[PDB]
Amino acid sequence: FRPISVFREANEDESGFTCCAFSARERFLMLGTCTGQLKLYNVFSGQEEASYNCHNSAITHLEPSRDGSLLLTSATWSQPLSALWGMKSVFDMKHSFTEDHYVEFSKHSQDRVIGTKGDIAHIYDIQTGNKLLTLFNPDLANNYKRNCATFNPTDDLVLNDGVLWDVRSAQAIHKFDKFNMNISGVFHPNGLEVIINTEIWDLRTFHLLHTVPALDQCRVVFNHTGTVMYGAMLQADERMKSPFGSSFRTFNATDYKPIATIDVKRNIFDLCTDTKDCYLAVIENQGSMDALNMDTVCRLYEV
C-alpha cells in the first residue's frame, strides 16, 4: 500500500468528506460530504471539479452505475433517505426512496435498485421507480440491527436479514442461523458463497466452509477481479461520527487467508476499490469522535 495522493475538501475550515466511489471517468473520484453534497475531485491533484447538493444531512453511502449514467446516494436522517440521480447531461434526481436508508444497484443487469428499510427489502424498477417486490417474512427474520439487503452476482438471489430469497419466485430459500446482533451478510462475487459476519456458507449445500474471526462486525468490499477482500470493523452503535475504526484488513478471497492488516491510525469513514485492481481510496478522519467537527481526508493508495 503505497500512498499516491491525499487531499481534503477544498476551501473548508474542517474537511467533511464522508464516502467515496470511483467515477466511470478516469482520474475522477466522487465524494459525499457531511452537508449532503456530492463532489467530483481529481484524485491525483486534489482539485474540486464539481459539486451538487443531494441531501440535507451527511451522505453515508454512494454507488455509481457501471455505465456512468446513474448514481445512488443515501443520507443519515433526511427525507428521502436514499435517491437515484441521473449523471448524463444535467445532474438530476430520477427517483426518491423515502424510507430506505441503504440502497444498491442490481449487479448483472443494472435495471433495478434494492433498498433496505430496517428488516425489509424493497426492489424497484429503475425506469419507472415502481416498487416491484417487498421481501420480508416475520417468521424467518433475524432482526439484524444493521441489516443491508443485497443482490447476488446474477440478480437471481437476494440476501436480506440473513434470509436467502429467490427473486423471481419471491420465495425464501433458506434462513441462515443468527450468530451476531448486527451484520446480515453479503454474496461473494464467485456466486457460490455468502459471508455473514464471521461465517462463510456454501450456497449449494448450506454447510459452513470457514470461520474468519477478524471479520466480526465488518463491512467488506472486493477488488475488481474478486481475488482480494477488504474488511473494516464498524464502531459499536449531533454530527455524523466515524462509522469504522482505524484499521482495515485484506484477505485472499479464494481461501480467506489474511494478507495484510493496515492501521492508518485515523478512524475510517469509507473505502472504495477502482475497476482495475490498482487503486484504493480511503476516507480517514484526522479528528476524534469527541471533536466538534469531522476533519477527513481522502487517501489514494496503490495496491
Ligand SMILES: COCC#Cc1[nH]cc(C(=O)N[C@@H](CC(N)=O)c2ccc(F)c(Cl)c2)c1-c1ccc(Cl)cc1F
Ligand atoms: C454508521 O451509519 C452511517 C454509515 C456508513 C458507512 N460508510 C461507508 C460504509 C460502507 O459499508 N462502505 C463499504 C464500501 C461500500 N461503499 O459499500 C466498506 C467496505 C469495506 C471497508 F473496509 C470499508 Cl472501510 C467500507 C457504511 C456502512 C456502514 C454500516 C452498514 Cl450496515 C452499511 C454501510 F454501507
Ligand SMILES: [Cl-]
Ligand atoms: Cl480545488
Ligand SMILES: [Cl-]
Ligand atoms: Cl448529518
Ligand SMILES: [Cl-]
Ligand atoms: Cl454482535
Ligand SMILES: [Cl-]
Ligand atoms: Cl468522528
Ligand code: NA
Ligand atoms: Na495529490
Ligand code: NA
Ligand atoms: Na445539503
